[PDB]
Amino acid sequence: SLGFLGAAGSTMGAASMTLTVQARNLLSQLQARVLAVEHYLRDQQLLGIWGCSGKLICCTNVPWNSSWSNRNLSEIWDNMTWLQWDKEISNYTQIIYGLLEESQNQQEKNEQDLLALD
Amino acid sequence: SLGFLGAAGSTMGAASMTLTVQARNLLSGIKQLQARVLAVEHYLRDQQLLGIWGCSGKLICCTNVPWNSSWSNRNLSEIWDNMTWLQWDKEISNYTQIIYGLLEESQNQQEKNEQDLLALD
Amino acid sequence: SLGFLGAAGSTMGAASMTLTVQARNLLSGIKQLQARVLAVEHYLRDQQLLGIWGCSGKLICCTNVPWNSSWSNRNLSEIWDNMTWLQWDKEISNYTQIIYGLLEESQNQQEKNEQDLLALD
Amino acid sequence: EVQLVETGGGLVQPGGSLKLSCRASGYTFSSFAMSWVRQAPGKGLEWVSLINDRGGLTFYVDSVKGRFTISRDNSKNTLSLQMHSLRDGDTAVYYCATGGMSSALQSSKYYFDFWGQGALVTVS
Amino acid sequence: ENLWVTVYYGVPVWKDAETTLFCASDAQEIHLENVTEEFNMWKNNMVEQMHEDIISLWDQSLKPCVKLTPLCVGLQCTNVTNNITDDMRGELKNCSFNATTELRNKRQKVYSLFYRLDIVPMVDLWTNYRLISCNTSAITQACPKVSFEPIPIHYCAPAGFAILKCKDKKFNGTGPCQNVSTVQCTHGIKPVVSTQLLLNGSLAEEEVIIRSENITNNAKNILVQLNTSVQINCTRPNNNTVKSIRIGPGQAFYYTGDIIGDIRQAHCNVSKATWNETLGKVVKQLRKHFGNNTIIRFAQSSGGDLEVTTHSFNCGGEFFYCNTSGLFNSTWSITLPCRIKQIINMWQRIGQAMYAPPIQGVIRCVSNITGLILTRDGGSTTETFRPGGGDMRDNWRSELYKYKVVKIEPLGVAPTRCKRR
Ligand SMILES: *[C@@H]1O[C@H](CO)[C@@H](O[C@@H]2O[C@H](CO)[C@@H](O[C@@H]3O[C@H](CO)[C@@H](O)[C@H](O)[C@@H]3O)[C@H](O)[C@H]2NC(C)=O)[C@H](O)[C@H]1NC(C)=O
Ligand SMILES: *[C@@H]1O[C@H](CO)[C@@H](O[C@@H]2O[C@H](CO)[C@@H](O)[C@H](O)[C@H]2NC(C)=O)[C@H](O)[C@H]1NC(C)=O
Ligand SMILES: *[C@@H]1O[C@H](CO)[C@@H](O[C@@H]2O[C@H](CO)[C@@H](O)[C@H](O)[C@H]2NC(C)=O)[C@H](O)[C@H]1NC(C)=O
Ligand SMILES: *[C@@H]1O[C@H](CO)[C@@H](O)[C@H](O)[C@H]1NC(C)=O
Ligand SMILES: *[C@@H]1O[C@H](CO)[C@@H](O)[C@H](O)[C@H]1NC(C)=O
Ligand SMILES: *[C@@H]1O[C@H](CO)[C@@H](O)[C@H](O)[C@H]1NC(C)=O
Ligand SMILES: *[C@@H]1O[C@H](CO)[C@@H](O)[C@H](O)[C@H]1NC(C)=O
Ligand SMILES: *[C@@H]1O[C@H](CO)[C@@H](O)[C@H](O)[C@H]1NC(C)=O
Ligand SMILES: *[C@@H]1O[C@H](CO)[C@@H](O)[C@H](O)[C@H]1NC(C)=O
Ligand SMILES: *[C@@H]1O[C@H](CO)[C@@H](O)[C@H](O)[C@H]1NC(C)=O
Ligand SMILES: *[C@@H]1O[C@H](CO)[C@@H](O)[C@H](O)[C@H]1NC(C)=O
Ligand SMILES: *[C@@H]1O[C@H](CO)[C@@H](O)[C@H](O)[C@H]1NC(C)=O
Ligand SMILES: *[C@@H]1O[C@H](CO)[C@@H](O)[C@H](O)[C@H]1NC(C)=O
Ligand SMILES: *[C@@H]1O[C@H](CO)[C@@H](O)[C@H](O)[C@H]1NC(C)=O
Ligand SMILES: *[C@@H]1O[C@H](CO)[C@@H](O)[C@H](O)[C@H]1NC(C)=O
Ligand SMILES: *[C@@H]1O[C@H](CO)[C@@H](O)[C@H](O)[C@H]1NC(C)=O
Ligand SMILES: *[C@@H]1O[C@H](CO)[C@@H](O)[C@H](O)[C@H]1NC(C)=O
Ligand SMILES: *[C@@H]1O[C@H](CO)[C@@H](O)[C@H](O)[C@H]1NC(C)=O
Ligand SMILES: *[C@@H]1O[C@H](CO)[C@@H](O)[C@H](O)[C@H]1NC(C)=O
Ligand SMILES: *[C@@H]1O[C@H](CO)[C@@H](O)[C@H](O)[C@H]1NC(C)=O
Ligand SMILES: *[C@@H]1O[C@H](CO)[C@@H](O)[C@H](O)[C@H]1NC(C)=O
Ligand SMILES: *[C@@H]1O[C@H](CO)[C@@H](O)[C@H](O)[C@H]1NC(C)=O
Ligand SMILES: *[C@@H]1O[C@H](CO)[C@@H](O)[C@H](O)[C@H]1NC(C)=O
Ligand SMILES: *[C@@H]1O[C@H](CO)[C@@H](O)[C@H](O)[C@H]1NC(C)=O
Ligand SMILES: *[C@@H]1O[C@H](CO)[C@@H](O)[C@H](O)[C@H]1NC(C)=O
Ligand SMILES: *[C@@H]1O[C@H](CO)[C@@H](O)[C@H](O)[C@H]1NC(C)=O
Ligand SMILES: *[C@@H]1O[C@H](CO)[C@@H](O)[C@H](O)[C@H]1NC(C)=O
């Protein structure tokens, strides 16, 4: 299992299989506890604004723009680590999150209409 | 586009398109700590109340509880196109707890039915 | 309608109908902030643990982990009809960490299988 | 009460493609779902496709699901229907119409209300 | 129509609520179209919280300071030997006492000038006066090198709450407000503490606003918010030389050493023409509630102690108590003498006394007058208005009148033709 962050130096396709190890160490002086709770809740709220409510791996309907990163999957997942990838796409992260929100909003209305057919 | 509560004076059909704008602003010495704990508790109580209705992770959640004509005898062309959420919230201050109880009971029945269907070989 | 923990002495099959009654009572100077923060932390640890298992938003969550007869060799007519949740907890507490680990691993495998199924054009 | 004007095409060979369009005036286009309905010269009416008010949801009959695409532009008040792999059996007058499904917050319809003037599709 | 309950989260609605606001300082605003909100400045819990916050911060600032226990002695006070003007005779005394020093067994004879208002006569044979507060409470010296200048403070709502601001012109503090906006933090409000006149604050945009609860009840204070500021020049024209001694290990006491030159009375200058026009503006906006043919009279603030009968304020760090007799004497340059006081009991407290250290040189302040606190006599064809104040909530109601704190209720239900299955 390697432990907490033990896959930080591993490739993305290897580190992505240890997400629960990282997730279980996010919740476990009062200012520190409230700050940790707020950060956890802000991340869960961002996941819930998107359709990724209860999932650790979540596939969305936002296509990947080659202007964000033009690497093929044989480099992102097999060669690159999450730290290097996180550095590469920092400048576009706030763009990507916005598009994710927009996609879910459209999906919610579409689902509301699809469930409205008698 | 209009910002937090910007759609408050718009009709509820139009204000329903700003649910993420409202949701993002609910989470963000002793008074600061008490205020932060209180905001967290209000957020978690609303999230638990959604969760027990089967609406976890959704901002628009359809249910299977029928609308009683005694709660508000209005057509959708009037509720959604000519009324705001504030006026509606005032109008159904009464019966809100009845609706919440019915939603909780409907979700309990749905969870039992799903458990029985998934256990059906 | 038995109240908070009113079903504590009821059988497991009967007590499972009161999951929302116990669930809604989990959320509601520095001594009181420590108490409130600990209540929030316990709630969030339980909700995160449910999320890891793929059970987020549900009070009755069915899984793909087979039951090991070494954990308990009782049949359903004994566990659900002639046993309470307290007695069951006393019997299973030695094995709940193995069960939790198996639930986490099963959900991780399920998430990878779902991602691969959604990758078929 | 409202005006719907279709633009048609000419004669297309089997296996080709043809684009129909429809322009709306006199009402808020973005507030209503739109549909396309087919009528063969000697037969009755047949519904072919339905699109909702936002253009996000499209529905078709089984016979055209892999051949016809319906598209909506709410800024130009324009509908289009792009038909591929046309056969001689698809020769018909196609109409655009306002009606069909309503988007959950509106009163239920499930009917066609306003009709255009028709457009001819002839397939050799 | 076979309608079903649909649950929405993120609903833009709110309910009135009272919560704890946090403070911010400088080390968005969203206009709500078609939103009418009912305001009530007299039930606004932001005022009670601001009052408690200012008192708490005041107590925290004064707590770690010199307790001046050695000053509750007997004072050998004589007449000041300098050149004293006609109206300052007997208002300042030259008092000699034996004060302690670092060594417990050594005492030093200290001469200091005290104002007559800071000392009380007694009938001991060898000593004539004592400090006014020594029979009531300990006197804490304010820490030196600490300013009393109001610094703009912003009150900010917790997440999940919002502050609504009323943008209506000529808004009288209660009732519907049609032009509203949502903010997270208020504007910078200066915690100015004064009586009878509001000195530094929000100015009215179009006209003078007469703002009161139950205006027919004369017992309620009327807050007058001016649309033009009247400039008041506050001066203490005495070149004060300040001396300092130590009275214990780590303790130091500051006192008036001498006055260089002649001794003159402190004054406030309010322009006669500008104030006359300001009173005309107040009267024109006041007749609306009493009748166009009702005679409106202004009279002085008869009744109460110095704190409420005079215009009190903190100028430089000295507390001025100005006799506003020339501003409120009319039937429809003004120089006001001011008394300076150093043993201060602020708000309505009795047992918490503070000693304001003297400031070297000559103090000059240039302040605005943006509003007034008036009261009305009770009991035909004439009305009498007098300066009021001393409660100190009015000084903050005059700034918080446009803000309301609301709790956001993001969850709601509505009928839709949408069935879950
Ligand atoms: C209402 O606002 C006016 C304008 O700010 C206030 O007057 C200002 O008061 C401060 C008090 O600290 C003055 O600062 C002092 O200035 C002297 C100048 O020699 C300096 O030696 C001190 O160390 C300190 O910096 C400031 O100059 C003064 N402004 C003007 C234009 O005179 C006034 O006090 C406010 N009213 C109340 C009741 O607080
Ligand atoms: C307020 O106005 C009076 C005018 O009556 C000022 O008094 C004058 O002050 C100057 C200052 O040196 C003297 O030279 C004049 O002789 C004074 N005039 C009289 C008639 O006594 C007073 O100084 C002003 N105060 C402020 C604070 O501006
Ligand atoms: C100073 O203030 C007092 C009231 O606060 C003014 O009125 C005097 O009040 C006392 C007691 O109420 C009376 O004995 C005096 O006769 C009053 N004065 C007059 C002129 O009638 C007083 O006038 C103010 N001082 C100045 C210089 O205006
Ligand atoms: C570090 O790199 C080596 C080189 O392939 C690899 O075998 C090893 O697994 C990596 N470490 C981790 C923790 O993945
Ligand atoms: C990628 O981003 C650029 C930025 O302007 C935009 O023009 C382009 O259309 C985007 N492409 C996709 C496929 O989203
Ligand atoms: C991905 O791109 C790189 C370019 O540096 C190339 O060398 C590599 O072969 C590509 N991957 C595949 C699978 O073709
Ligand atoms: C990709 O793989 C090559 C293998 O030689 C390595 O040198 C390079 O650093 C890798 N890229 C990154 C971003 O680590
Ligand atoms: C990202 O931003 C940093 C500074 O904000 C800049 O130095 C860097 O070059 C940017 N990277 C890209 C890929 O735009
Ligand atoms: C307020 O009402 C007017 C009336 O036509 C409407 O046009 C406007 O959009 C409304 N405001 C908002 C924010 O929807
Ligand atoms: C609606 O509420 C009324 C309450 O007076 C009740 O009598 C009625 O049965 C309810 N309708 C349904 C369909 O449950
Ligand atoms: C909705 O109900 C109101 C109530 O009188 C009615 O006037 C209006 O015509 C109704 N709308 C529709 C579309 O039926
Ligand atoms: C809710 O019910 C109470 C019961 O007396 C009534 O007084 C109140 O007016 C009702 N409110 C609404 C909005 O119908
Ligand atoms: C307690 O036991 C008796 C035994 O018959 C049973 O009838 C009763 O329902 C039990 N109480 C509860 C709360 O389940
Ligand atoms: C669970 O059952 C298997 C056989 O199915 C057994 O090998 C294993 O040891 C059991 N687990 C425990 C913890 O005893
Ligand atoms: C099933 O349960 C009954 C009691 O209800 C018990 O007597 C029987 O032995 C059990 N059978 C098993 C575990 O095979
Ligand atoms: C199990 O059944 C017996 C039958 O008599 C009953 O007495 C006992 O109370 C039951 N146990 C529970 C926990 O309900
Ligand atoms: C759980 O393990 C402890 C450790 O020895 C043991 O004493 C206890 O009896 C076990 N519990 C059960 C129910 O077997
Ligand atoms: C106070 O009295 C002392 C007596 O020695 C004298 O020296 C001092 O100058 C006096 N102060 C004033 C202001 O006259
Ligand atoms: C001190 O001044 C007061 C002021 O009225 C006067 O009455 C008293 O006689 C003076 N004392 C002396 C000793 O001159
Ligand atoms: C202190 O003495 C003064 C002398 O006038 C008196 O008025 C006041 O009431 C006294 N205070 C107390 C608390 O005894
Ligand atoms: C509301 O007040 C602001 C303050 O400047 C003003 O700009 C705006 O025009 C006002 N709106 C209305 C509708 O009066
Ligand atoms: C005082 O009023 C003047 C107008 O003459 C204004 O420019 C100044 O900013 C005001 N100062 C304060 C502190 O309100
Ligand atoms: C203040 O209000 C009065 C009302 O009579 C008006 O005449 C004057 O012009 C106003 N001044 C400003 C600066 O708005
Ligand atoms: C304030 O305005 C409201 C608006 O209705 C009015 O009812 C009230 O009497 C006014 N009060 C004063 C003191 O002007
Ligand atoms: C003011 O209070 C008195 C107290 O009895 C009451 O009679 C009167 O009606 C009130 N007036 C207003 C305008 O609230
Ligand atoms: C007060 O007197 C001292 C004595 O030197 C002098 O330096 C200072 O400038 C004087 N101040 C004023 C305001 O006259
Ligand atoms: C004193 O007040 C008058 C009012 O007429 C004003 O003109 C003057 O500038 C003020 N003095 C100072 C130093 O600000």
Numbering used by the authors:
A (entry chain F): 519 to 546, 575 to 664
B (entry chain B), C (entry chain E): 519 to 546, 572 to 664
D (entry chain K): 1 to 52, 52A, 53 to 82, 82A, 82B, 82C, 83 to 100, 100A, ...
E (entry chain A): 32 to 58, 82 to 141, 150 to 309, 311 to 395, 413 to 459, 463 to 504
Text from the published report:
Cryo-electron microscopy revealed that elicited Apex bnAb-related HCDR3s possessed structures combining elements of several prototype Apex bnAbs. The primary hurdle to eliciting Apex bnAbs is believed to be the low frequency of bnAb-precursor B cells possessing a long (≥ 24 amino acid [aa]) and acidic HCDR3 that can penetrate the glycan shield and bind to the positively charged surface within the Apex epitopic region. We designed a slightly improved germline-targeting trimer, ApexGT6, with affinity for additional PCT64- and PG9-class precursors, and we evaluated B cell responses to this trimer delivered as an adjuvanted soluble protein or mRNA-encoded membrane-anchored protein in RMs.
The structure of RM038 in complex with ApexGT6 also showed a 1:1 stoichiometry and a tilted angle of approach relative to the 3-fold axis. From a top-down view, RM038 used its extended long HCDR3 to bind to the center of the apex of ApexGT6, similar to that of PCT64 LMCA to ApexGT2 (18), but with heavy and light chains flipped as well. However, the HCDR3 of RM038 was less extended towards the 3-fold axis than PCT64 LMCA. Overall, the HCDR3 of RM038 exhibited hybrid features of PCT64 and PG9 when interacting with the apex epitope of ApexGT6. Cryo-EM revealed that some of the elicited Apex bnAb-related HCDR3s possessed combined elements from two Apex bnAbs, PG9 and PCT64, when interacting with the trimer immunogen. Our findings suggest that ApexGT6 could potentially induce hybrid responses with the high precursor frequency of PCT64 and the high neutralization potency of PG9. This hybrid HCDR3 structure has been observed in humans, implying that these findings might be relevant to human immunization.
